[PDB]
Amino acid sequence: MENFQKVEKIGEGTYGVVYKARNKLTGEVVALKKIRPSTAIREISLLKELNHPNIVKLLDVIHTENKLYLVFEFLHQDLKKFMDASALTGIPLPLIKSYLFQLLQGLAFCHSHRVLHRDLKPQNLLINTEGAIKLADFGLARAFGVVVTLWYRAPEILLGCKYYSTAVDIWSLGCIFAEMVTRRALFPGDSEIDQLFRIFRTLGTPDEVVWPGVTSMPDYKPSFPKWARQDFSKVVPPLDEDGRSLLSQMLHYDPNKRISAKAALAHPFFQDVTKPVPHLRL
């Protein structure tokens, strides 16, 4: 490339290939994302203004030769790989707590600036050797607008609601919190209906009592099986009551009842939060 030198492919992103690259002029190592619309350019460019310790910095938006690339700060490893690497022993609770606290700070910051992620998953949560965790790709979904992982999708999205709210990110984070704890995905659906029914089998089929307006959602069907809610103590067993109470508030069916990132930061679960050093194999 004219302005960069590719080091290697990191993986397949939602919008195109993501490469580890080196800036020709500065020598800095970055995550270069090729995007496979003028409104998009202006919108994404606004995201360069976001700066928070728990948000992966969008360094630049490059539009040349009629191709679009996004330049992001490069982090050491993603949470998916770290969880896989920590499968035999599990991520220590203090580190799970630290990561959840930091992720909520990142969401609180973005949400306060009216920016949603909409597709949070372990793959876009990045960590470093110092104990920090950061979220990448906030705001891209709104700007770009559409195998895909459905495991972290909020129910309102699965039911076809075309209006998103900050609550979709809290749902995804709750799913990730559960996965760090149990070392297994909470709702590993293989299709949209399987994803929805896995949520229903665990949290109970929603109704107008727990979620006013659910029966009028676009893809809701009166024929959905009616499953009873499972005892929450069976869903993420290890986790103590503070952790379980917080998780339950992040997984409420009605997005309006779901706890905000700001309110979650004040939950008793974080009374003893610390910032441990992770054991990272790079």
Ligand SMILES: Nc1nc(Nc2ccccc2)sc1C(=O)c1cccc(C(F)(F)F)c1
């Ligand atoms: N900034 C940034 N640093 C990264 N370092 C890294 C280095 C080694 C292993 C894993 C991640 S990855 C990354 C992403 O922003 C990102 C987000 C979603 C998906 C992907 C991909 F999977 F590669 F398509 C990448």
